[PDB]
Design a protein around this motif. Structure first.
Motif, PDB file in Angstrom:
ATOM      1  N   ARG A   3     -10.015   3.772   0.587  1.00  0.00           N
ATOM      2  CA  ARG A   3      -9.020   2.736   0.826  1.00  0.00           C
ATOM      3  C   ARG A   3      -8.964   1.676  -0.275  1.00  0.00           C
ATOM      4  O   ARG A   3      -7.933   1.023  -0.469  1.00  0.00           O
ATOM      5  CB  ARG A   3      -9.230   2.075   2.198  1.00  0.00           C
ATOM      6  N   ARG A  17       0.839  -1.215   0.000  1.00  0.00           N
ATOM      7  CA  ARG A  17       0.000   0.000   0.000  1.00  0.00           C
ATOM      8  C   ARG A  17       0.865   1.253   0.000  1.00  0.00           C
ATOM      9  O   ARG A  17       1.627   1.502   0.936  1.00  0.00           O
ATOM     10  CB  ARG A  17      -0.982  -0.002   1.195  1.00  0.00           C
ATOM     11  N   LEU A  18       0.724   2.062  -1.037  1.00  0.00           N
ATOM     12  CA  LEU A  18       1.552   3.251  -1.205  1.00  0.00           C
ATOM     13  C   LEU A  18       1.144   4.376  -0.277  1.00  0.00           C
ATOM     14  O   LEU A  18      -0.046   4.605  -0.050  1.00  0.00           O
ATOM     15  CB  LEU A  18       1.440   3.724  -2.651  1.00  0.00           C
ATOM     16  N   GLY A  19       2.137   5.074   0.262  1.00  0.00           N
ATOM     17  CA  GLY A  19       1.818   6.182   1.154  1.00  0.00           C
ATOM     18  C   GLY A  19       1.532   7.486   0.429  1.00  0.00           C
ATOM     19  O   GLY A  19       1.845   7.632  -0.751  1.00  0.00           O
ATOM     20  N   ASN A  20       0.960   8.451   1.147  1.00  0.00           N
ATOM     21  CA  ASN A  20       0.958   9.838   0.682  1.00  0.00           C
ATOM     22  C   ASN A  20       2.360  10.213   0.243  1.00  0.00           C
ATOM     23  O   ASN A  20       3.322  10.005   0.977  1.00  0.00           O
ATOM     24  CB  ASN A  20       0.603  10.774   1.841  1.00  0.00           C
ATOM     25  N   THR A  27      -4.048  10.287  -0.256  1.00  0.00           N
ATOM     26  CA  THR A  27      -5.118   9.537   0.407  1.00  0.00           C
ATOM     27  C   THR A  27      -6.385  10.379   0.619  1.00  0.00           C
ATOM     28  O   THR A  27      -7.484   9.830   0.803  1.00  0.00           O
ATOM     29  CB  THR A  27      -4.660   8.953   1.749  1.00  0.00           C
TER      30      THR A  27
END
Ligand SMILES: *[C@@H]1O[C@H](CO[C@@H]2O[C@@H](C)[C@@H](O)[C@@H](O)[C@@H]2O)[C@@H](O[C@@H]2O[C@H](CO)[C@@H](O)[C@H](O)[C@H]2NC(C)=O)[C@H](O)[C@H]1NC(C)=O
Ligand SMILES: Cc1noc(C)c1-c1cc(C(=O)NCc2ccc(S(C)(=O)=O)cc2)c(=O)n(-c2cccc(Cl)c2)c1C
Ligand SMILES: [Cl-]
Ligand SMILES: [Cl-]
Ligand SMILES: [Cl-]
Length: 215
Positions: free
Chosen positions: A151, A115-118, A146
């Motif tokens: 999600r 899951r890629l972050g901001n 995000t």
């Protein structure tokens, strides 16, 4: 792609054009010699028997002998929900197998559940509307966000100007840190609003499923 730039020819050899009687309608990504993946919405209501899968393309207005063309033999679905625009992914099995070369290559995918972050920096791409349809493959720097994203999506936003994916970019890969993390799914506020991030089907949520189909 609105506000992007022309790609160097064949920079993204996994990039695919889905076509109907010679006209681009959606992007896709080569994920095995005989499979591409795209957005489920791309082939909703479409005559799948008429779809042509075009590999090794750069400028669609030109004759390009680098190109390889296939028909679609079968589709594999994973719970596409058009009402909520969820699970917007399809695998198209080709009627033959690509010759893998400099211009035609299989994409690399993330691990299941990544899951890629901001703040992750990615490249979006495609032959979709420029603001008509592009002739030359376009690419665009974007940033993962995000905010205003569920999600169940990966979303991106270009900071500080209006730029983004558009119609006909549907189905195209989002490349982050060398891996295909998204399939272009939907925009809000019109293309390149500068307000709503672009939403992609999150490829990493579907990797075990993809792997089971393509080997
Ligand atoms: C604009 O994007 C390019 C390309 O993005 C990288 O490569 C994509 C395929 C994908 O993996 C992205 O997540 C990557 O960020 C960036 O190009 C890199 O630039 C640096 C120098 O800044 C250079 O060392 C790398 O070789 C470049 N990578 C490639 C593949 O060309 C570029 O930095 C981005 N610019 C901004 C301001 O976001
Ligand atoms: C046309 C068309 N035909 O079927 C579909 C789906 C569309 C459609 C709908 C949409 C669409 O309905 N967008 C609006 C929207 C509003 C609200 C929400 S949500 C679930 O977050 O409240 C999602 C999408 C859309 O964006 N796009 C789109 C356009 C440009 C690029 C890309 Cl990748 C996709 C498309 C192609
Ligand atoms: Cl059709
Ligand atoms: Cl993670
Ligand atoms: Cl909207």
């Amino acid at each position: 792609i609105v506000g992007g730039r022309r790609a160097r020819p064949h920079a993204w050899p996994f990039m695919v054009s889905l076509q109907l009687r010679g006209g681009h309608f959606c992007g896709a990504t080569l994920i095995a010699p005989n499979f591409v993946m795209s957005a489920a919405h791309c082939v909703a209501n479409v005559n799948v028997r008429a779809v042509r899968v075009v590999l090794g393309a750069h400028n669609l207005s030109r004759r390009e002998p680098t190109r390889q063309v296939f028909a679609v033999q079968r589709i594999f679905e994973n719970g596409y929900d058009p009402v909520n625009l969820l699970n917007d992914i399809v695998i198209l099995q080709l009627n033959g197998s690509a010759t893998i070369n400099a211009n035609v290559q299989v994409a690399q995918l993330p691990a299941q559940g990544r899951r890629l972050g901001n703040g992750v920096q990615c490249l979006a791409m495609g032959w979709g509307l420029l603001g008509g349809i592009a002739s030359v493959l376009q690419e665009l720097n974007v940033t993962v966000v995000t905010s205003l994203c569920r999600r169940s999506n990966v979303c991106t936003l270009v900071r500080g100007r209006q730029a983004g994916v558009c119609f006909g970019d549907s189905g195209s890969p989002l490349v982050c840190n060398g891996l295909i993390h998204g399939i272009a799914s939907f925009v809000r506020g019109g293309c390149a609003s500068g307000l709503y991030p672009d939403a992609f089907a999150p490829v990493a949520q579907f990797v075990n499923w993809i792997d089971s189909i393509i080997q």
